Amino acid sequence: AYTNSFTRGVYYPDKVFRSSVLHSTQDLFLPFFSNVTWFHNPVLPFNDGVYFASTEKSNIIRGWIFGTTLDSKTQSLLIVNNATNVVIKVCEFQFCNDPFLGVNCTFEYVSFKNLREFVFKNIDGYFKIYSKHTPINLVRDLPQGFSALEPLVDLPIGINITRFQTLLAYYVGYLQPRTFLLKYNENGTITDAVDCALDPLSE
Amino acid sequence: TKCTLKSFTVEKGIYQTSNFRVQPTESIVRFPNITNLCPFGEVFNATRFASVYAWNRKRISNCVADYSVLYNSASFSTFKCYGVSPTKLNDLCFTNVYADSFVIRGDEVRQIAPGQTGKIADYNYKLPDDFTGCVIAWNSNNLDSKVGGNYNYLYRKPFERPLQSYGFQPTNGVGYQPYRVVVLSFATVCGPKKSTNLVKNKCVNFNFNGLTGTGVLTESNKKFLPFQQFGRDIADTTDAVRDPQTLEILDITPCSFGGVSVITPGTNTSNQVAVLYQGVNCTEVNVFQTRAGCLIGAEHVNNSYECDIPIGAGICASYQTSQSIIAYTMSLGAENSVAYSNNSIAIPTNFTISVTTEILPVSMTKTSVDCTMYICGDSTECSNLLLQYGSFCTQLNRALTGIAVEQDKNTQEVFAQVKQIYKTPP
Amino acid sequence: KFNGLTVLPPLLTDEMIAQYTSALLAGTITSGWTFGAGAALQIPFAMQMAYRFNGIGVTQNVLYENQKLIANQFNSAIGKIQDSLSSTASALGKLQDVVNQNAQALNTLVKQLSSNFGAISSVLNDILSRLDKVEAEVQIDRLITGRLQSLQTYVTQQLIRAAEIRASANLAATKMSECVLGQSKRVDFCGKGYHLMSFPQSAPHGVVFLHVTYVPAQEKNFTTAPAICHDGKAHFP
Amino acid sequence: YTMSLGAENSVAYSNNSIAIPTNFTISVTTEILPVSMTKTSVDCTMYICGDSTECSNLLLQYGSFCTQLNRALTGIAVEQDKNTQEVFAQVKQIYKTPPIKDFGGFNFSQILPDPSKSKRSFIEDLLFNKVTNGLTVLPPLLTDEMIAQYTSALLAGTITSGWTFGAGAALQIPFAMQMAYRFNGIGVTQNVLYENQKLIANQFNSAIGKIQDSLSSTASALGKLQDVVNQNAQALNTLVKQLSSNFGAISSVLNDILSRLDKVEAEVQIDRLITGRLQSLQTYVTQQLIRAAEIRASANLAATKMSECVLGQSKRVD
Numbered sequence A: 001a002y003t004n005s006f007t008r009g010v011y012y013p014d015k016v017f018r019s020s021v022l023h024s025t026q027d028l029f030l031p032f033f034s035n036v037t038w039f040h041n042p043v044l045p046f047n048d049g050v051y052f053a054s055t056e057k058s059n060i061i062r063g064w065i066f067g068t069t070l071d072s073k074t075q076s077l078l079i080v081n082n083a084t085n086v087v088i089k090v091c092e093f094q095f096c097n098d099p100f101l102g103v104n105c106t107f108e109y110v111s112f113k114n115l116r117e118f119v120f121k122n123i124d125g126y127f128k129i130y131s132k133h134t135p136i137n138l139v140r141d142l143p144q145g146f147s148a149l150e151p152l153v154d155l156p157i158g159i160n161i162t163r164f165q166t167l168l169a170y171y172v173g174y175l176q177p178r179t180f181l182l183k184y185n186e187n188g189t190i191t192d193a194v195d196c197a198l199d200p201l202s203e
Numbered sequence B: 001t002k003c004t005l006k007s008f009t010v011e012k013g014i015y016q017t018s019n020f021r022v023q024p025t026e027s028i029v030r031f032p033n034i035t036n037l038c039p040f041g042e043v044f045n046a047t048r049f050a051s052v053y054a055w056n057r058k059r060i061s062n063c064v065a066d067y068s069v070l071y072n073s074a075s076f077s078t079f080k081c082y083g084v085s086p087t088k089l090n091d092l093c094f095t096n097v098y099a100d101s102f103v104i105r106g107d108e109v110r111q112i113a114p115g116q117t118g119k120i121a122d123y124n125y126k127l128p129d130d131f132t133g134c135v136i137a138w139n140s141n142n143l144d145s146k147v148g149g150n151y152n153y154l155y156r157k158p159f160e161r162p163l164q165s166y167g168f169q170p171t172n173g174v175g176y177q178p179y180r181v182v183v184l185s186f187a188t189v190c191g192p193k194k195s196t197n198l199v200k201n202k203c204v205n206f207n208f209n210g211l212t213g214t215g216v217l218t219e220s221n222k223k224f225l226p227f228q229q230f231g232r233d234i235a236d237t238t239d240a241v242r243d244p245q246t247l248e249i250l251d252i253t254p255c256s257f258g259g260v261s262v263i264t265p266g267t268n269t270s271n272q273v274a275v276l277y278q279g280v281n282c283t284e285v286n287v288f289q290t291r292a293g294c295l296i297g298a299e300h301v302n303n304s305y306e307c308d309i310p311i312g313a314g315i316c317a318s319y320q321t322s323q324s325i326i327a328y329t330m331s332l333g334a335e336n337s338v339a340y341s342n343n344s345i346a347i348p349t350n351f352t353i354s355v356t357t358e359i360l361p362v363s364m365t366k367t368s369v370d371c372t373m374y375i376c377g378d379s380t381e382c383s384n385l386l387l388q389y390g391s392f393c394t395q396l397n398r399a400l401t402g403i404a405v406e407q408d409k410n411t412q413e414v415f416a417q418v419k420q421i422y423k424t425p426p
Numbered sequence C: 001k002f003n004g005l006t007v008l009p010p011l012l013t014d015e016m017i018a019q020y021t022s023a024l025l026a027g028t029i030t031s032g033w034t035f036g037a038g039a040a041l042q043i044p045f046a047m048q049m050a051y052r053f054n055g056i057g058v059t060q061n062v063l064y065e066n067q068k069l070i071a072n073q074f075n076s077a078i079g080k081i082q083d084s085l086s087s088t089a090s091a092l093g094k095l096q097d098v099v100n101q102n103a104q105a106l107n108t109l110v111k112q113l114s115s116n117f118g119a120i121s122s123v124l125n126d127i128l129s130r131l132d133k134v135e136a137e138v139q140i141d142r143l144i145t146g147r148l149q150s151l152q153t154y155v156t157q158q159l160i161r162a163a164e165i166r167a168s169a170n171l172a173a174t175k176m177s178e179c180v181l182g183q184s185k186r187v188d189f190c191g192k193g194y195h196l197m198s199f200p201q202s203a204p205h206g207v208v209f210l211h212v213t214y215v216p217a218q219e220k221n222f223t224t225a226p227a228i229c230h231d232g233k234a235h236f237p
Numbered sequence D: 001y002t003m004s005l006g007a008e009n010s011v012a013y014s015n016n017s018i019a020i021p022t023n024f025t026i027s028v029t030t031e032i033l034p035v036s037m038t039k040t041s042v043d044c045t046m047y048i049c050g051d052s053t054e055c056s057n058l059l060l061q062y063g064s065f066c067t068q069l070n071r072a073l074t075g076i077a078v079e080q081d082k083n084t085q086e087v088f089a090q091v092k093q094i095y096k097t098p099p100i101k102d103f104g105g106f107n108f109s110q111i112l113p114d115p116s117k118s119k120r121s122f123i124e125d126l127l128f129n130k131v132t133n134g135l136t137v138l139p140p141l142l143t144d145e146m147i148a149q150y151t152s153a154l155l156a157g158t159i160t161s162g163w164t165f166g167a168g169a170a171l172q173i174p175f176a177m178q179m180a181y182r183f184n185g186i187g188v189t190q191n192v193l194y195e196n197q198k199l200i201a202n203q204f205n206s207a208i209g210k211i212q213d214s215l216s217s218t219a220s221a222l223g224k225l226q227d228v229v230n231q232n233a234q235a236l237n238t239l240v241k242q243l244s245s246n247f248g249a250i251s252s253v254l255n256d257i258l259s260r261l262d263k264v265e266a267e268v269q270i271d272r273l274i275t276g277r278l279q280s281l282q283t284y285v286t287q288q289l290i291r292a293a294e295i296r297a298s299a300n301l302a303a304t305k306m307s308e309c310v311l312g313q314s315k316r317v318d
């Protein structure tokens, strides 16, 4: 199954304030009006990194697993939100299909009515996470319009990622190396964007 | 000015002899509050350690390191390095802080030091001269062993496992007795982030989280989002930063700079000069603030005259009489109420024939440059290299030949408008 | 000075330029504008000047009734040109600046031969005496690249300066056609005043026009009217 | 579509037919001309080398380049003051307008100075509202208030004295009589003015009103001046953005090169930044020399338009 991304999946590309200005940047972005795979799950490719989102009113989706194998042979990311705090660890983990709810190691870290949206990417051994939250009316598809995702985590863990899966209404899209033009308002929030490759007017 | 013009005589004018540039008064460094130091108490201050002939290492990462304290620590009676010194290590960072710790007889521990020799450095606790760091050891006969000897210790990869349980005794001196020791080698494991006080409103050199430059740091009304660290102007230029120890936003202004122009009458007329610091404020440098910059060594005057030497922003300077350089708002000419009314006319009753000279340039000095002789000076070895650049020398000769023929045409079009050489009567 | 830089002579010598300014001037004096429009037609100079007064809306009799005075004012004003040009060089700032710009451009181009551009020496014979071929070529490439960039800089600035001098030569050619071979009505084209005539004089790298202009003087105020009634009808001049 | 060049018109020619105009309109066609660039000078040592001593020494090996660039930009900068002065300073005295405005019904109030404002005219205030690293911008010699005193003097001379203030001292003449000369200067018998004086005054006053409306309703009129401001800003921003370029170097941040490498390798990498920044600055100065030649051609045109169109009455068609 699929739905249209519309203008979703843009994020703050760098740690820099800019205001009342338009900045052109090339990065791994979810392309505008691309098709986003819909789920209600199996192991998925990671490709050039992932946009992930879920329409929610219940908090059933608790986490993710990432790696090459996602199992035993090499260090693999486990990421969990348990409502006490966010957990991250990178062990050579072993489990069943997943440690999902029935309702060696080298690093560790701690920190429908709504959409939760996220981006996961990996450049130069920095694994990165971004997010945003908003209220919504539509349950069937990602909401139209725009609001940029902002960074949560930025880890020099140096792992190679080619596969991932979710830990238990949810959506997956792939980032691609594309030029975007980003509009920063007077307060230095991104308020609009252009995918330059979308159409001749966007070029 | 004489040196700027490469001349001992200077004609009347204004000359940019130099550039004024306010120097950084001091250097700032700011980094975040020091945190996540590697827990080396588990190496040096713990109640036990492994036997040194059977030891193994582990790596610290995502951390600071206590190396700045370790470079002057009392925790060892002796120390040595295969890498750089600990004072350099406290100023550096590495992929991980690889380290190990153990109990041994003191001389057997020395026989496993980085770049040392013996069955320890050979196999029981390996220690090649390629080890990317330092090690330390001290006597421990009261705690590293029993009253019966070094049974809690051992003797004989880097800092890891000819070995056996140690032969040391608690009655011995620090070489023969039981001892405690550790060794390490070298991004994610770094020395501490030493940081200065903050200095607003002075021109300063600065470091903020590895951004560097010279500027006047100023308190500001900008509202960075909680994840943003730097601010940038339209053309990439950094124009604000967040202070990493107290998260307010500092607007960065460049340290004041500008052309220094020397205003002079001719050296015939005087050796006295005035200096304009273009766009500079007089607080940053007689003294007079013009809109063009701070002007020094000229008198501000309330009269107005024709513009002699142009300063800019309506100001001109001149040399006047007992003598000095003055500076004044230039006169655009005398004002005149034309005596207009709906029935008044003025009619000239006489004339002057005025022979106004006008002078126009018409031709340059016709030049041709033999680009092979200019570039290569009659060297064959050079001329063969100039062929690799292809058409450029031919294209430059063609361009200068076009200019040269054009000077003859310019001269022909002006003067040769007459078909016949007319002659004047006797 | 030997370094491939050469100055070529103009096609016209300064004596040939002076024969042209002589011919332009002898035509202008003996024949008025007519030598531009066809064959030179002789006309007495006091009659040429009455045509030139009539060409600025000053009636011919204003010349003849003042011919001694107008002749003396011209002769005296030519005297003031000699006195000005004999007194100070500062009048010819345009031509002497054109000479200076070319001399500074050539001296910059020569001084750039002494620049290293990152080579071990700027003297090409030092490189070729000290270094063997494979090393020498690396240093000579820096001198070639720098001297070639210096010569492209020179030729680019001489192309832009030649375009400025050609704009001035087209202007001088137009001033000669309209101010010398004719009487221009273009306000302030042939000097500040109502233009009468101009005389070309040669100067190195340039030309000088002695723009003879009528400038009015000694005005009186009068009451004036747009029109005048007579037998109830309006009369206009 | 294939463009139309204009409406088709067979002119009604025959060997004995003439068309004579029985009436006229006074038009007031605005024309807009560039006269000066933003005067600029670049401290080429501070632009190329960023106040680094290690780079500043290497830039000496290039000799006169970072000196003939300043001489070129100084020539352009002095030339902008010359361009501005050749256009506006065509007047010997700062003429001023009488207190009373008895100009035969013509109403210059929107183009004459407003003393409640700089003391610019109403239309000059519309025109001023419509237009919107070692690099330094230098002020013009004439301030905008001096330029406005020259356009006031030119305009007050033009109104009170006709062409006469160009040819000698300003001779006063009534404005209805000055326009009667302007009518003879186009071969229209001057009684046509005096007999249509109220109509001609109203056509002028209304045509001036249409300039205020046009300048208030669209910015597109000032495209020539806004294009000059845009080209100056585009050139300077391009020159600054080129500091961020690598030119094959390890980084475009000069302090990275000076900290990541030993001095021998660092000098090779810095010499790429020097070569690229110097080529960037030579490219900028060359474009500014060509653009200054274009602006000088426009300033010489504007100076000629002021001499012939303002200080006189040009008979040169269009």
Ligand SMILES: *[C@@H]1O[C@H](CO)[C@@H](O[C@@H]2O[C@H](CO)[C@@H](O)[C@H](O)[C@H]2NC(C)=O)[C@H](O)[C@H]1NC(C)=O
Binding pocket: D107, D109, D110
């Ligand atoms: C000259 O024209 C201006 C407008 O172009 C006239 O000024 C306006 O006059 C009316 C009526 O008094 C006022 O309501 C407006 O506020 C004025 N506008 C401005 C901008 O001042 C002016 O009255 C005319 N003068 C003469 C003598 O006719």
Ligand SMILES: *[C@@H]1O[C@H](CO)[C@@H](O[C@@H]2O[C@H](CO)[C@@H](O)[C@H](O)[C@H]2NC(C)=O)[C@H](O)[C@H]1NC(C)=O
Binding pocket: D022, D023, D024, D025, D199, D202, D203, D206
């Ligand atoms: C010449 O043309 C003008 C318009 O340019 C005519 O003036 C208009 O006349 C009408 C009445 O016929 C008035 O309503 C308008 O207000 C006038 N306009 C202006 C600007 O005054 C004029 O009547 C024509 N004259 C002749 C003899 O044809």
Ligand SMILES: *[C@@H]1O[C@H](CO)[C@@H](O)[C@H](O)[C@H]1NC(C)=O
Binding pocket: A002, A033, A034, A035
């Ligand atoms: C992919 O998206 C486009 C709109 O951008 C749409 O036309 C197309 O049908 C989608 N493809 C699928 C398989 O749904």
Ligand SMILES: *[C@@H]1O[C@H](CO)[C@@H](O)[C@H](O)[C@H]1NC(C)=O
Binding pocket: A082, A084, A085, A086, A087, A110, A111
């Ligand atoms: C939730 O995670 C935190 C660490 O983030 C941990 O301390 C806590 O014990 C966990 N609780 C449950 C119920 O998993």
Ligand SMILES: *[C@@H]1O[C@H](CO)[C@@H](O)[C@H](O)[C@H]1NC(C)=O
Binding pocket: A072, A092, A104
């Ligand atoms: C951990 O790593 C060691 C080698 O360093 C290996 O012998 C061991 O089998 C690994 N164990 C797991 C669960 O990965």
Ligand SMILES: *[C@@H]1O[C@H](CO)[C@@H](O)[C@H](O)[C@H]1NC(C)=O
Binding pocket: A074, A158, A159, A160
């Ligand atoms: C990741 O992949 C690179 C090659 O792309 C390889 O050199 C590196 O050893 C890999 N690291 C891990 C932890 O798999």
Ligand SMILES: *[C@@H]1O[C@H](CO)[C@@H](O)[C@H](O)[C@H]1NC(C)=O
Binding pocket: A185, A186, A187, B223
């Ligand atoms: C900027 O943010 C403040 C709250 O921080 C808000 O009140 C204001 O309206 C915002 N302004 C703009 C232009 O978005």
Ligand SMILES: *[C@@H]1O[C@H](CO)[C@@H](O)[C@H](O)[C@H]1NC(C)=O
Binding pocket: B033, B244, B245, B246, B247
């Ligand atoms: C850093 O530490 C000081 C006290 O030493 C404290 O006042 C300040 O708030 C801290 N800053 C941050 C960013 O935690």
Ligand SMILES: *[C@@H]1O[C@H](CO)[C@@H](O)[C@H](O)[C@H]1NC(C)=O
Binding pocket: B266, B268, B269
């Ligand atoms: C300067 O002095 C020289 C002689 O030394 C003289 O020829 C020249 O005319 C003088 N110029 C001025 C402006 O005094």
Ligand SMILES: *[C@@H]1O[C@H](CO)[C@@H](O)[C@H](O)[C@H]1NC(C)=O
Binding pocket: B281, B282, B283, B289
């Ligand atoms: C800067 O110059 C202005 C006048 O241009 C002056 O008022 C001000 O005091 C100067 N700045 C300082 C810090 O003195």
Ligand SMILES: *[C@@H]1O[C@H](CO)[C@@H](O)[C@H](O)[C@H]1NC(C)=O
Binding pocket: B302
């Ligand atoms: C010059 O002008 C200032 C005010 O700008 C005034 O205080 C001063 O008295 C004046 N001096 C003279 C000699 O006019």
Ligand SMILES: *[C@@H]1O[C@H](CO)[C@@H](O)[C@H](O)[C@H]1NC(C)=O
Binding pocket: B349, B350, B351, B352
């Ligand atoms: C006209 O002016 C000249 C000087 O230019 C003077 O000699 C002559 O007497 C004057 N003539 C009259 C009629 O005023």
Ligand SMILES: *[C@@H]1O[C@H](CO)[C@@H](O)[C@H](O)[C@H]1NC(C)=O
Binding pocket: B339, B346, C219, C220, C221
């Ligand atoms: C004309 O008359 C006025 C007084 O009505 C006077 O101010 C002005 O100076 C006179 N002009 C001439 C040229 O005589």
